[PDB]
Design a binder for this molecule. Structure first.
Ligand SMILES: [Cl-]
Ligand SMILES: [Cl-]
Ligand SMILES: [Cl-]
Ligand SMILES: [Cl-]
Ligand SMILES: [Cl-]
Ligand SMILES: [Cl-]
Ligand SMILES: [Cl-]
Ligand SMILES: [Cl-]
Lengths: 218, 218, 218, 218
């Protein structure tokens, strides 16, 4: 409540590989953590232009910016100033798999995100390597507590050029760097929109709204 | 609209195996399909008492009873009177796997469900064979259209005796027996409660509420 | 050694569903269990002609007929006369999944196999429903002991019409009906050949050679 | 045949993360590529001592050193001097997942391997984070050709302290940097032994024997 301002900014430092292609990305964002609203601008600082769809990286560029009701303990925020980290597995329906690790720290009014992205087995003629994806459908992450950690499961889906979907299952484990009050079985709905970008996506702007809630039908 | 009364009844005829144990179940239910409210009474007619947790069978005992808004085409209802079928895969976090097939038909004011359940690899000392489960947490099924079919993905979870959860991923493919108007990316929230049962669950009563909706944060 | 003749015969009684299609199969086979050589004739007694590739059922039609060296304890044979059962999960690379349960008993010189097959989510335009498969490539099952059971993992592959492969991962758990001497980490190589069949595969003849061995490079 | 000496040496440059823990490793090895025999010495140059079992990294430290019969085209060797790369997915039975990318180049009598390792979701009280593993059981990789690539599937297993096994499924895709003669359905048996190491595994010596063969029972 005192550790996180109503208006925060954050920096993203991501590096990784996709089918063996190394790359680096830097971002500058801001938003209202208690409102669940945020925005960020990314810049491919190395390895660009990327030979793959930007969409697989968009969800890797900020959990603190999630609107949690008062009756539902905010796992991520509580962890600060200590901070926290998250580990993610992404299984695409065509065999591709990604493992992503994050470390979230805080310094005053700014959050710092260090991210390592590892993605491979993306079919050369698939939607990713052919850049045929058109953003993510809004999602709903199932979250529960286990071993002092918060685990989130999400059935994500990328909109395909000309109609259709490219499926991907998300599993993210959030690990606070200090004991916090564990939440109950809940969900976080999100809508991530790429609001701007250049011709080759070496520059991108993203908009995200994340709101937590109890089961709709309890 | 004319094929399905506001108040319907249905019969369930299920047979199958769990770790090689054959069994048979018969049910009698009713509800308001357009209200998404239903109830059913099950009776283990063969193989009882079952040496496993009833909870794995509860979700196998009625899609027509789902409240769909008017702006979201009801895939299942449209299929009638022709009817439809569904195929389901259940992956429990401890290795157990179940495949379930259903056939839904209609005769006047009564729906008939024929179900075949195949479940195996349930650890002998696990929550299922030890009957340590305590009902399902409310769920949220992600649904989209593909190849004239409706596919649903759900991150289900069984409440464990003494706290904790026993996870299970659901994937259900709904196949209408006739071309129908396909729906867009949506969800169906549910809460399935075992409202009554005898000492050995050879007799069970279930309550279910299923409501469809558009993404909470679009 | 006394419970199993050098020349045995067996009967197969299989029933099940594939994408909701019920069927029944009966078989009559024979072979030399200690030689790992066997043959069997199948007859679709119900639900035929099957609207799917026979190949998915061929591996479901006899572990006792496996040549085990003397330095490697034969898990399956030891279980007799008590017998044993096995549970199997089949994951095809295109999403299809099958769960199979078996019960193996013995009466004199004849083994009796009761089998329940549940398969679904086979794409309508896939190799299975389109009958474009041409038999299994020889396989190698990785076997080890756990909880008094023997678990086998196999990377199977169906030869496709015109070249190529249709992959399927096999996981089989063998459960002896009585405590037996557990084996060490080993393998069983097999070659299953459809030696004869009629136009619509309502009648089939299969040939199988199964030999156990220690790791080739220890 | 002329591009690869009968006696080669190689250098390994690996970096990565495990549950968010960054690390770096350097290796110096040698062996007889056509004999399938090789050895290598690893040194944790950064992030050591590693808080996890070394065994998960041992298989990441040399395909060129595999003995292929003459009747079976050597995919990896043919690719040189152009070289090749490989992408790997590792699924441990307790939920942990690793994605590994490699790039193999050649300069005279020395192979250079650049490796990126990403592993996460290793349970804090599991065999890996608790360093309770004792080397890999010998393995057998199922290999076949697809899309000009060679795909290998392996059912690996880590020996546990006090008996038992910690399972892990391997899937490796080999991508030659130039068109080569594709091989048929075959296998590669291996035995990887940690021949020496210091108290905290910041220094390790490994021995590997890899031999290719046709199906044992064709
Ligand atoms: Cl907890
Ligand atoms: Cl809560
Ligand atoms: Cl459609
Ligand atoms: Cl809609
Ligand atoms: Cl054992
Ligand atoms: Cl042995
Ligand atoms: Cl090819
Ligand atoms: Cl070959």
């Amino acid at each position: 409540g005192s550790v996180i301002a109503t208006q925060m900014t954050y920096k993203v430092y991501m590096s990784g590989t996709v089918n063996g292609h190394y790359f680096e990305v830097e971002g500058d964002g801001k938003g209202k953590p208690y409102e669940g609203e945020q925005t960020v601008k990314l810049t491919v600082t190395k390895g660009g232009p990327l030979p793959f769809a930007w969409d697989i990286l968009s969800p890797q560029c900020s959990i603190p910016f999630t609107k949690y009701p008062e009756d539902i303990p905010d796992y991520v925020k509580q962890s600060f100033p200590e901070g926290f980290t998250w580990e993610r597995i992404m299984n695409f329906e065509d065999g591709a798999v990604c493992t992503v690790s994050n470390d979230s720290s805080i310094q005053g009014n700014c959050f710092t995100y260090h991210v390592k992205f590892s993605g491979l087995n993306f079919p050369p003629n698939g939607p990713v390597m052919q850049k045929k994806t058109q953003g993510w459908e809004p999602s709903s992450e199932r979250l529960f507590a286990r071993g002092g950690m918060l685990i989130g499961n999400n059935f994500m889906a990328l909109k395909l050029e000309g109609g259709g979907h490219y499926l991907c299952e998300f599993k993210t484990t959030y690990k606070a760097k200090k004991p916090v009050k564990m939440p109950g079985y809940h969900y976080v709905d999100r809508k991530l929109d790429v609001t701007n970008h250049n011709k080759d996506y070496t520059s991108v702007e993203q908009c995200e709204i994340s709101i937590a809630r109890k089961p709709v039908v309890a």
